Scaffold this active site. Structure first.
Site, mmCIF file in Angstrom:
data_model
loop_
_atom_site.group_PDB
_atom_site.id
_atom_site.type_symbol
_atom_site.label_atom_id
_atom_site.label_comp_id
_atom_site.label_asym_id
_atom_site.label_seq_id
_atom_site.Cartn_x
_atom_site.Cartn_y
_atom_site.Cartn_z
ATOM 1 N N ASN A 1 0.806 -1.207 0.000
ATOM 2 C CA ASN A 1 0.000 0.000 0.000
ATOM 3 C C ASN A 1 0.845 1.264 0.000
ATOM 4 O O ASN A 1 1.703 1.442 0.808
ATOM 5 C CB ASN A 1 -0.975 -0.082 1.185
ATOM 6 C CG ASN A 1 -1.675 1.221 1.468
ATOM 7 O OD1 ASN A 1 -2.436 1.703 0.656
ATOM 8 N ND2 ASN A 1 -1.376 1.824 2.612
ATOM 9 N N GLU A 2 0.531 2.154 -0.939
ATOM 10 C CA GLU A 2 1.083 3.527 -1.022
ATOM 11 C C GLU A 2 2.605 3.755 -1.167
ATOM 12 O O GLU A 2 3.178 4.545 -0.434
ATOM 13 C CB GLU A 2 0.553 4.370 0.141
ATOM 14 C CG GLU A 2 -0.636 5.242 -0.264
ATOM 15 C CD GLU A 2 -1.715 5.321 0.798
ATOM 16 O OE1 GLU A 2 -1.398 5.071 1.992
ATOM 17 O OE2 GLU A 2 -2.891 5.664 0.426
ATOM 18 N N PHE A 3 3.238 3.080 -2.116
ATOM 19 C CA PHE A 3 4.628 3.223 -2.326
ATOM 20 C C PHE A 3 4.924 4.337 -3.328
ATOM 21 O O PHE A 3 5.362 5.363 -2.945
ATOM 22 C CB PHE A 3 5.200 1.899 -2.812
ATOM 23 C CG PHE A 3 5.454 0.957 -1.708
ATOM 24 C CD1 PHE A 3 4.426 0.256 -1.135
ATOM 25 C CD2 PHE A 3 6.697 0.859 -1.164
ATOM 26 C CE1 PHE A 3 4.668 -0.564 -0.064
ATOM 27 C CE2 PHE A 3 6.959 0.037 -0.093
ATOM 28 C CZ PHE A 3 5.938 -0.689 0.457
#
Ligand SMILES: *[C@@H]1O[C@H](CO)[C@@H](O[C@@H]2O[C@H](CO)[C@@H](O[C@@H]3O[C@H](CO[C@H]4O[C@H](CO[C@H]5O[C@H](CO)[C@@H](O)[C@H](O)[C@@H]5O[C@H]5O[C@H](CO)[C@@H](O)[C@H](O)[C@@H]5O)[C@@H](O)[C@H](O[C@H]5O[C@H](CO)[C@@H](O)[C@H](O)[C@@H]5O[C@H]5O[C@H](CO)[C@@H](O)[C@H](O)[C@@H]5O)[C@@H]4O)[C@@H](O)[C@H](O[C@H]4O[C@H](CO)[C@@H](O)[C@H](O)[C@@H]4O[C@H]4O[C@H](CO)[C@@H](O)[C@H](O)[C@@H]4O[C@H]4O[C@H](CO)[C@@H](O)[C@H](O)[C@@H]4O)[C@@H]3O)[C@H](O)[C@H]2NC(C)=O)[C@H](O)[C@H]1NC(C)=O
Ligand SMILES: *[C@@H]1O[C@H](CO)[C@@H](O[C@@H]2O[C@H](CO)[C@@H](O[C@@H]3O[C@H](CO[C@H]4O[C@H](CO[C@H]5O[C@H](CO)[C@@H](O)[C@H](O)[C@@H]5O[C@H]5O[C@H](CO)[C@@H](O)[C@H](O)[C@@H]5O)[C@@H](O)[C@H](O)[C@@H]4O)[C@@H](O)[C@H](O[C@H]4O[C@H](CO)[C@@H](O)[C@H](O)[C@@H]4O[C@H]4O[C@H](CO)[C@@H](O)[C@H](O)[C@@H]4O)[C@@H]3O)[C@H](O)[C@H]2NC(C)=O)[C@H](O)[C@H]1NC(C)=O
Ligand code: NA
Lengths: 913, 913
Positions: free
Chosen positions: A459-461
Site C-alpha cells: 500500500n502507497e509506495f
C-alpha cells in the site's frame, strides 16, 4: 499406516506472563488479550481508553503452555512434527524442554521435527510457546547501528515505532482508524502430526493454478484456448521416487477424471498438470454477471507398487480468467477516443467491467475471535450495496481460506495485497528470505480461489512513500528505490510468477503503470514512474481533500482510470458508541471520544489530543457548512443527532464522487472502478467506515447502494455557474433504453407551476458500460423556481435490460430513485412532515408516510438488540406517497419486539430542540 | 485591625504521587481519586471492577502543593495560622519547606502557627500537604509487637485489615454495601488566618447548649422551667482579661437582647450563659409534629475599654428538649401494663412519639463531591416516606454543619454516633488523647443543631462484638470489657456531659440499657449488660434473618422496645446498573455484578466470588419461593425483570416487619420506633438500600411510605393456622375514629359472593400512639373463598383527626390503601390487566387504568434522564377504577420529554416471555 493427528485445540492450555504473577486458562487458537479478558483480568479490549491502559500487555512476554500431551507413539519408526498454521509473531517453541524453533513471521506456516525431543522425554511431553513483546524486540533491532535507518518522515509511526522490522500485521501497532494492541499468540490453527514409515503423507499446502493455455501474468489470455489445471502439493515427509498423480474434478456430475502429466517431485513437493477442452468447464462469474460455478478437485498421489494413495488433497476451484490491466493505452483504444497513457482496469473472462465496492480492513484487532457468522453478515451487507469487488487492504493480513471461500461462492472479487504498507522496508538477505517464505506460502495457499483477482505488492509506495523518501533524503533515494524494485519487483514478481500463471500483479496499490514486463530483464516489470506526457492519463486515483469548501465541487475530483480510495470520516451511531464508552462520555468532544479519533494519529505513544482534535474539527466544519446544526436540549439526543449529521455529509460526498467516477466510464478517461475508503470498522470510533464494528449501517451504505445500482440517473450541480446536468449511467454489457421522470415540488409537496420549466419526463438510450446526458438547465435562466429554498426535484429512472450472461430471455426492470436540491440542505425550508410509521407482521414491511409535507433524508433506525439492514434508507418522501421498507434480519436478541422500537426521522428533526 | 483570611479554595493546587511520575491539577477541598478522575488519569471510581483496579492509589502517598501564596503581611506584629477543618487522614504539613504539623485524625480541626516559617521565607510561601498511604501506615502500626492485638474474629476485615488503628471513616476500607477506596486529601475547607495585635480574634468553633434549667443528660427535663442558653466560643489568639459577652436572639422579631452572666475565659475559649422565661421562645418540633421554629443567635465578645467586639459568632438554633430514654421501666409503667425491663425510646418536649425512618450511610465514597442538591433530593425522599428520624450510622463520619442544617429546618431528628463500628478499638493514652480531640471538637461543633437527637458511642458493641470477644478469648475478655467502659463511658460520657446538658447518650447503638447514671461513679453509666430477668424486655432490636422460609412469619420477628436495624438486600434498577457496568455485564450473575455484591464481604483483599455469591443466592431463593420467576427472551429485559422481583420481596418483607413493630406500640412491649436498614446506597450494587446511588426509588420506599402513614390498616396472616387479622394502628397523640372498607374480588375484579363472608365495612376507635384489632377470620372456617388463588382483599382506611400541635381546628383526613392476598404472589392466577397509561400536561398527573382485570404490584418506571419520585407506586388496581399519580420532578435533562418515556407494568409482566 495412516497419519496420526492431535489438534492443538483439543489440548489443554495455560497462559502465563513474563513476571510470574499472572496465570489464566488458555485457548488455541487465541491471543493473550483475549484469554486475559475471558478470565476477568481485563475488560473488553475495545472499551474506554484501553488503547492506553492495556499497554502493559504488549510490553511483556506471554507463554502458552500445554498440559503433558498423551497418546503419542514412542516408536522410532515414526516421525513427529509440529505444524503451526500461524504464530503471532516472535516466539520460542519448546517440546519436552528443548528449543525446537524460533518463528518470526505471523504470515508463515511453521513445522518442526520433534522426534528426538520426544525420544529423550522421560514423561509425556509439554509443548510451550513463549511469545515476545514485539515493541521491545523491534526497538532492540532498530537501536543497533548495524541495521538500516530511514528519515523520520518515512518511518513516522501511528503509535508504536519501528514496525518496518517485523513481519506482523502492521495495523497492530495502530492506524488512523484503529487501536494498537500488538496482540500475540497462536493466532491460527495448529497440530501435531505423527507419520509412520512407508505410510500416509501429511498435506501442508496445495497450489492449484487453473489458467488458459499460453496465459501469462498481466496479459489478456486467449478465451478460445484449452484450460490447464496445474496441481503442486507440499507435504511431510517421504514420497518415493516415480510418484504418479490423478485428479477427480466434480460439480461443487464429473467434469474430469484422469491422470496428471509432466509429474515432477522433490523432497517436500509433488507437481503435475492436465489439459481440458475449452468446451467442458462452466465459467465462474462475479455476482450479477452470471453464475458462481465452482468445482471440487481432489488430487491423489500414488507410488509405484502401492494400491492406494499416500497423499490426498482437496480444494474448491473455479474456471475463469481475471486480468488486471495496467499496460499502455493501445492505438486501437486511442482511435476509439480514449485518452492515451496507461490502463488501470479489470477483465473477467475477457470482458471489461465496472468495479464497484470498497476497501476491507481487518474487522477486529484480534483475528482469532473473527467468526463465520460475523463475516457472513459483513458479506450480506457487501452484496446488498451492489458490490462486485473488495480491495483487501495491506496491512492487516492474508485472509484465511475460509474467508476467500465466502467470497468465492458469493462472487465478490478480492483484490489482494502483500503485507507492506505506508512505510519503506528493509532489504537485507535475512529479511528478504523471511518475506520469500511468506510470499511463497500465501501465494501458493490462495491461488486456487476463484475470488482472488490480483496481487499488489503493498500500500502507497510510488504515489506517497517513495516521493516522501526522495524529498526527505535525495542523496540516498536511488538506493532506496533500488531496494523497492529489488524486493517488490525482482524478488516478489518472480515468486508470484513461479507459482501462478493466472493472477496479475502490481508492485504497489497505486502507480502509473508499466512500460514493459519481461522475465528476461533484471527488473522484470519496468515501471513508468514519472516518465509521463502532458495530457495523458495514468493509474488509479485517491481523494482525501479535507477542505469542506470544495467537497461537492466536481472540478476538484481526480480524473483517472479507476478510483481505489476516497473518503471523509464520520461518527458512528450512538448505539455503537454506547458499546464501548461510559454514559458520561457521550458528547461530541468528550475526552474519551476525542482520544478514540485517530484521524489524525498521535505519531508515537503520547495522548495526542491536538492531533485527534483536527479530525473532530473536520467533521464539525462539514456539518456547519452544509447541514442543520443540532441544538437538542437532552444532551444524549444532541450527541446522537450530531453523530447523524456527520454521516449525512459523508454519504452525500461519497455519492457525489461515485456518480462522477461512474459517468467517467463514457468520457475519454474511460473510468472503470469505484472502491470507497472504507467498508468497515475495527472498533467504535469516528472513521471513514460505512459499516460500524458490529455491522450497523451508517447513512453511507444506503446511499452507495443506490449509487452502485446497474442503471442510475445522477444530478450534477455546478453551483458557481448555477447549472444543473442530469446524466444516466449504466454498467450493463449491452445498450439499454428507459425513461426518467422529473418532478419539481415545493417542500409541502405542491407541484411547482409548469414543473419549473422542465420536462416532466424524458426517454434515454445508453451504451454498454457508458453514460448519456439527458438534461441541462441553468437554474435562473432556463427554469422558473419561485423559491429555491422551497424546492426539490424528485428523479425516478426506469429501464429494461439484461444482466450479463442471463439465461432467461425475460428482461429485468431496473429502477433508481434520486433527488436534486437547488440549495444546500441547511438552506432548505423544511417543515414538520408529520411522519407515520407502522409495521406489518405478515408482510414484514414497515410502512412510512409523510402526512403534512415533503420529508428529506428520511431515516429509520433499528434498535440495539438486532443486526441487519433496511432495503432502503435516507430517502425523499412526498406526502400521500406510501413507501414500504423491509429489513434483512440477521440476528435478533429481542424475541421479535425490536419492530416496536424502530423509529423514523428526517432532516427536520435535526433542527428541533 | 480586622482578621485577614485567605480561603485555601482560591489558591492554586497541584497533586503529585509518591513516585514522581503523576502530576495533575488539584482542588481544595478534594481527595486524590477525584482530582485524578478530573484529569482523565482514571475513570469514574464507582465503575466496573475499580474497587480492585484502583488499589494502586490507596497504596501510595499523594501530595497537595500550592503555588507560592501571595498577599500575606510579613510584619512581626502579626500571627499567621493555618486552619484546617478536615484533612484525610495521616498528613505532613509544610509551610515554606518547614514541617509545621503531622495531623492524624480525619474528624478534627487542626491549626498551626506558621509565623516563624513565614519570617524565614525568602519568597512567597508554598504550602504542601503530603498525605500517607493509610493501609501502609496501619499495617506498620499493627506489625509492631509493642501494640495491642485482638483475636482474628474481632478484627476480621471487610477488605483492608487493621482499620481499628486509624481515626478515619471506617467504611473507607470497605463495607458489605460499599467499596474500599481509602481516599486522602483536604476533605473539608481550610484557610490561612492573619491576626494583628490588639485586633479581631478568629472563631474556631462554638458550642451553644440550650436546655431547661436543671436538665441533665438522659433524664426527662422539667417542661415548665426557664431556658438556659449557654455559649462557649473557641478562638485564635489573644483575648484580654475581664472580657464580656452579649447576645441577640432573633427569628430565623427579637426574642432576646442581653448580656451573658457567669463569664469564664482561658487561653483559647470564652464562655457565658443567660436564662430566658419559659414563656418567651416558641418550640421546635419534628415534621408532622408542629413547626420547625428556629432562631439566629449572634454572640459578641468585647473587652473592657473596647468600643466594638473583637469576636463574633453566629449559629442557627432551636428551643426544644430531646430525651433518649434507656433507664428502667418504672412501677408506673408496669401498673399501666407495660412489660418490665428497660426503655428504649425518644421524647420531644416531654412527649413520647413513634420514630419512623431508616439508617443513613455516606451517600458517596468521596465526601467532597457530596452536594447540597444531592442531599436536598435525599431529604425530599426522606420526608415523602413519612420519616421523622434518621440514624446517622457509624462509621462513615460526623456530618458537616450544612447537612444538619437541612435536617434542622425540615424537622428530621438525627440520631448521631461517634465513629466506632463493628470491631474493638485501642485504648492506649495517645489513641485516647486523639479520640478526645475528636469527641470534644464534634460534640461542641454539633450541639446547637435542633435536629441532633442523641449521641451513641458506636455501632454494634454490646450486642455483637463484645460477645464475639468473650467467645474468642475468654481469659482476656474482662480486660477488653474494661477498655470499652474506660473509652466509651468514663472518657466519652464525661466529655459529652462536659459540653452538653441537652443531648442524651448511650455507649453503643444497641444495648439492654443502664442500671445507674452518676458522674460520681468511676464508670458513670452502669450498663445492665446481661443482668436480666426472664420475661422482662430490654433494648432495641435487629433483624437479619436470611432464611427465606420464615421471612413473613411474625413469630420469627424480635419483640423489643424499638427496631433500629432490619433488612434484606435487593438489586438496584437496570438504569442504575447501567451507570457503572458494561452492557455485556448486565445479567444477574455476571462476574462484575457478583463482585460488586459485598454481601458477604471478602474478609480481606481477595476477589472473593464465593462470599459474594452467598448474597446472590439469598436474593434468588427469596424470589423463587414467593414471586413469579422471570424468563424473558430478551436477556436485558430478563435481567431488568429479575432485579425488580428481588425488590418486591424486600418491600413486602419490610412492610411485614414495620406493621408488626408499629402494632407493638399498643402491646406490653410498648414499641416506639422503626428504622429500617438502610435508607441509601454509596454506589451501584445489590444492597439493603431503598434509595439507589443517584436517588432512584426502589419498590421499598413506596411501600414503607404507606406503611409509615399516621393511621394504617394492616393485614397479619398466620399461614400455618390459616388465620387473618386486621389491625388499625395510629401514631397520633390523640384518639381517632374512622372506617375501613374491606372488598373481596377475584383477579378479574368481579366481587366474590357475599364478600367471602366478611363485612364490607367496619368502624374503629384507636387510642393515641396505639393499635386496635378490627377483624379476625379463619380463611377456611369463617370465610367462603371459592378459589384462594383467584382472590384479593382490597383494604381502604379513612380517619379524621389532628396532627400534634396543629393550629387550625379543621381536622385532617387520613387515608391508607392496602391489600391482602390469601396466597403467595407466585400462586396468584393473574391475567393480563391490559393497563393504560397517559399523561396530562396541565394537571401534571399520570392516569393509570386496569382495563381487563385486577393488576397487582402496578409499577411506574421513570426513565434515566430525570430525578424524582411518584406520589404512589406498587399498588393494586381494579378495572374501571382510575388512579391519578403525580411525580415530584427534582431534575430533568430530557427537556420535558421524559413523560413520554415513562412505562407501567404489573406482576403479570414478570411471567411473560
Ligand atoms: C505448475 O506449477 C509449478 C509451481 O507450483 C511450476 O513449477 C515452478 O516453476 C517455476 C518456473 O520455472 C520455478 O520457478 C523458479 O524457481 C527458482 C527457485 O527454485 C528453487 O526454489 C523453489 C522454491 O522452493 C521452495 O518452495 C517449494 C514449493 O513449496 C518447495 O518445494 C521447496 O522445498 C522450497 O520450500 C522452502 O522455501 C520456501 C521459500 O522459498 C518456503 O516457503 C518453504 O516453507 C520452504 O522453506 C523450488 O520450487 C525449486 O524447485 C525445482 O527445481 C529443483 C531443481 O533445482 C527440483 O528439484 C524441483 O523438483 C523443482 O523442479 C521444477 O522446477 C524447475 C525450475 O526451477 C524445473 O527445471 C523442473 O523441471 C521442475 O519443474 C528450487 O529448489 C528460481 O530461482 C527461478 O528464478 C529464475 O528463473 C526465472 C524464470 O523462471 C527468472 O525470471 C529469474 O530471474 C531466475 O533466473 C535467473 O537466475 C537463474 C539462476 O538462478 C538463471 O538461470 C537465469 O538465467 C536468470 O539469471 C539471468 O538473469 C539475471 C538477471 O535477470 C542475471 O543477473 C543472470 O546473470 C542471468 O543473466 C524461478 O523462479 C519454481 O521453482 C517451480 N516450482 C515448483 C514447486 O516446481 C510448474 O512449472 C507449473 N507447471 C505448468 C505446466 O505450468
Ligand atoms: C520473550 O520472547 C522472546 C521471543 O520468543 C525470547 O527471545 C528468544 O529467546 C530464544 C531462546 O533464548 C532465542 O532462541 C535461541 O537463540 C540462540 C541464539 O542467540 C542469539 O540470537 C538472538 C538474536 O535474536 C534476534 O533478535 C534480537 C532482538 O531480540 C536482535 O537484536 C538480533 O539481531 C536477532 O535479530 C535477527 O534475527 C531474527 C531471527 O532470529 C530476525 O527476526 C531479526 O529481524 C534479525 O534479523 C539473541 O536474542 C541472543 O542474545 C543471541 O544473539 C540460539 O543459540 C538458540 O539455539 C537453540 O535452539 C535452536 C532451535 O531454535 C537449536 O537449533 C540450537 O541447537 C539450540 O538448541 C539447543 O539449545 C537450547 C537452549 O538454548 C536447548 O533447549 C535445545 O534443546 C538445544 O540443546 C535459540 O535458537 C531467540 O532467538 C530469541 N528471539 C528473539 C530475541 O527474537 C525471550 O527469551 C523471551 N523473554 C522471556 C523473559 O521469556
Ligand atoms: Na542520505
Amino acid at each position: 499406516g495412516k497419519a496420526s493427528i492431535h489438534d492443538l485445540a483439543l489440548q489443554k492450555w495455560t497462559v502465563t506472563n513474563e513476571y510470574g504473577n499472572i496465570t489464566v486458562p488458555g485457548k488455541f487458537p487465541s491471543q493473550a488479550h483475549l484469554d486475559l479478558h475471558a478470565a476477568g483480568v481485563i475488560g473488553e479490549s475495545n472499551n474506554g481508553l484501553n488503547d492506553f491502559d492495556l499497554r502493559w500487555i504488549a510490553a511483556q512476554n506471554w507463554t502458552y503452555t500445554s498440559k503433558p500431551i498423551s497418546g503419542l507413539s514412542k516408536h522410532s519408526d515414526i516421525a513427529t512434527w509440529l505444524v503451526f498454521d500461524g504464530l503471532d509473531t516472535y516466539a520460542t517453541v519448546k517440546f519436552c524442554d528443548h528449543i525446537v524453533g524460533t518463528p518470526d513471521n505471523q504470515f508463515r506456516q511453521w513445522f518442526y521435527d520433534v522426534s528426538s525431543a520426544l525420544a529423550s522425554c522421560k514423561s509425556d511431553p509439554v509443548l510451550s510457546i513463549n511469545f515476545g513483546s514485539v515493541p521491545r524486540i523491534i526497538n532492540a533491532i532498530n537501536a543497533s547501528d548495524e541495521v538500516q535507518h530511514w528519515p523520520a518522515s518515512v518511518v513516522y509511526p501511528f503509535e508504536y515505532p519501528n514496525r518496518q522490522w517485523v513481519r506482523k500485521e502492521q495495523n497492530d501497532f495502530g492506524w488512523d482508524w484503529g487501536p494498537a494492541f500488538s496482540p500475540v499468540g497462536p493466532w491460527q490453527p495448529g497440530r501435531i502430526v505423527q507419520l509412520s514409515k512407508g505410510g500416509e503423507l501429511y498435506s501442508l499446502n496445495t497450489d492449484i493454478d487453473i489458467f488458459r493455455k499460453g496465459q501469462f501474468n498481466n496479459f489478456a489470455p486467449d478465451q478460445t484456448a484449452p484450460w490447464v489445471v496445474n496441481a503442486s502439493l507440499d507435504f511431510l515427509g517421504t514420497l518415493p521416487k516415480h510418484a504418479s498423480m490423478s485428479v477427480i474434478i466434480t460439480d461443487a456430475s464429473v467434469l474430469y477424471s484422469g491422470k496428471l502429466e509432466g509429474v515432477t517431485q522433490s523432497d517436500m513437493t509433488v507437481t503435475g498438470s492436465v489439459t481440458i477442452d475449452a468446451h467442458k468447464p462452466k465459467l465462474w462469474w462475479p455476482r450479477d454477471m452470471g453464475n458462481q460455478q465452482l468445482y471440487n478437485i481432489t488430487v491423489s498421489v500414488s507410488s509405484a507398487g502401492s494400491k492406494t494413495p499416500i497423499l490426498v488433497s482437496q480444494r474448491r476451484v473455479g474456471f475463469r480468467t481475471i486480468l488486471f490491466s495496467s499496460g499502455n493505452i493501445t492505438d486501437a483504444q486511442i482511435a476509439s477516443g480514449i485518452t492515451p497513457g496507461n490502463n488501470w482496469h479489470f477483465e473477467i473472462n475477457g470482458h471489461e467491467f465496472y468495479a464497484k465496492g470498497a476497501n476491507l480492513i481487518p474487522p477486529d484487532a484480534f483475528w482469532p475471535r473473527v467468526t463465520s457468522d460475523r463475516m457472513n453478515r459483513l458479506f450480506d451487507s457487501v452484496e446488498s450495496q451492489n458490490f462486485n469487488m473488495l480491495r483487501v487492504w495491506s496491512s492487516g493480513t492474508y485472509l484465511p481460506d475460509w474467508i476467500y471461500d465466502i467470497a468465492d461462492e458469493r462472487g465478490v472479487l478480492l483484490w489482494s495485497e502483500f503485507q507492506f504498507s505506508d512505510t519503506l522496508y528493509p532489504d537485507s538477505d535475512d529479511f528478504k528470505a523471511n518475506v520469500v517464505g511468506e510470499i511463497t506460502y500465501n501465494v501458493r495457499r490462495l491461488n486456487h480461489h476463484a475470488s482472488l483477482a490480483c496481487w499488489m505488492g503493498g500500500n502507497e509506495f510510488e504515489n506517497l512513500m517513495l516521493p516522501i523518501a526522495q524529498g526527505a533524503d535525495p542523496a540516498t533515494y536511488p538506493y532506496v528505490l533500488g531496494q523497492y524494485e529489488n524486493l517488490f519487483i525482482t524478488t516478489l514478481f518472480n515468486v508470484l510468477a513461479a507459482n501462478s500463471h493466472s493472477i496479475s500483479y502490481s508492485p504497489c496499490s497505486a502507480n502509473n503503470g508499466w512500460l514493459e514486463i519481461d522475465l528476461d530483464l533484471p527488473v522484470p516489470i519496468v515501471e513508468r514512474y514519472y516518465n509521463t506526457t502532458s495530457g495523458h492519463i495514468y493509474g488509479d486515483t485517491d481523494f482525501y481533500n479535507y477542505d469542506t469548501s470544495v467537497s461537492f465541487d466536481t472540478s476538484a475530483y481526480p480524473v483517472g482510470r479507476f478510483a481505489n480510495e476516497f473518503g471523509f470520516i464520520s461518527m458512528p451511531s450512538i448505539q455503537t458508541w454506547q458499546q464501548a464508552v461510559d454514559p458520561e462520555e457521550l458528547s461530541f468532544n468528550s475526552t474519551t471520544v476525542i482520544l478514540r479519533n485517530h484521524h489524525y494519529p498521535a505519531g508515537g505513544l503520547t495522548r495526542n489530543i491536538h492531533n485527534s482534535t483536527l479530525g473532530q474539527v473536520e467533521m464539525t466544519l462539514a456539518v456547519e457548512r452544509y447541514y442543520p446544526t443540532p441544538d437538542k436540549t437532552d444532551p444524549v439526543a444532541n450527541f446522537s443527532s450530531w453523530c447523524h449529521a456527520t454521516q449525512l455529509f459523508q454519504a452525500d460526498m461519497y455519492k457525489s464522487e461515485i456518480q462522477f467516477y461512474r459517468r467517467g466510464s463514457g468520457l475519454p478517461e474511460r473510468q472503470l472502478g469505484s472502491l470507497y475508503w472504507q467498508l468497515n470498522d475495527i472498533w467504535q470510533a469516528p472513521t471513514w467506515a460505512g459499516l460500524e464494528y458490529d455491522g450497523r449501517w451508517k447513512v453511507l451504505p444506503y446511499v452507495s447502494r443506490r449509487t452502485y445500482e446497474h442503471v442510475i440517473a445522477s444530478a450534477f450541480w455546478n453551483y458557481t455557474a448555477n447549472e444543473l446536468e442530469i446524466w444516466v449511467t449504466s454498467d450493463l454489457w449491452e445498450p439499454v433504453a428507459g425513461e426518467v421522470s422529473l418532478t419539481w415540488v415545493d417542500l409541502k409537496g405542491k407541484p411547482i407551476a409548469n414543473n419549473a420549466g422542465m420536462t416532466k419526463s424524458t426517454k434515454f438510450n445508453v451504451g454498454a458500460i457508458n453514460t448519456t446526458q439527458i438534461i441541462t438547465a441553468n437554474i435562473q435562466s432556463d427554469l422558473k423556481i419561485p423559491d429555491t429554498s422551497d424546492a426539490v426535484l424528485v428523479i425516478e429512472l426506469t429501464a429494461h435490460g439484461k444482466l450479463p450472461n442471463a439465461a432467461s430471455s425475460k428482461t429485468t426492470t431496473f429502477t433508481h430513485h434520486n433527488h436534486f436540491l437547488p440549495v444546500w440542505p441547511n438552506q432548505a425550508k423544511v417543515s414538520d412532515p408529520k411522519l407515520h410509521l407502522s409495521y406489518n407482521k405478515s408482510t414484514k414491511k414497515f410502512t412510512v408516510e409523510a402526512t403534512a409535507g415533503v420529508s428529506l433524508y428520511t431515516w429509520l433506525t433499528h434498535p440495539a438488540g438486532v443486526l441487519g439492514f433496511f432495503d432502503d434508507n435516507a430517502f425523499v418522501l412526498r406526502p400521500g406517497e406510501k413507501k414500504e421498507v423491509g429489513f434483512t434480519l440477521q440476528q435478533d436478541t429481542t424475541g421479535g419486539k425490536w419492530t416496536e422500537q424502530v423509529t423514523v426521522e428526517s432532516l427536520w428533526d435535526l433542527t428541533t430542540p
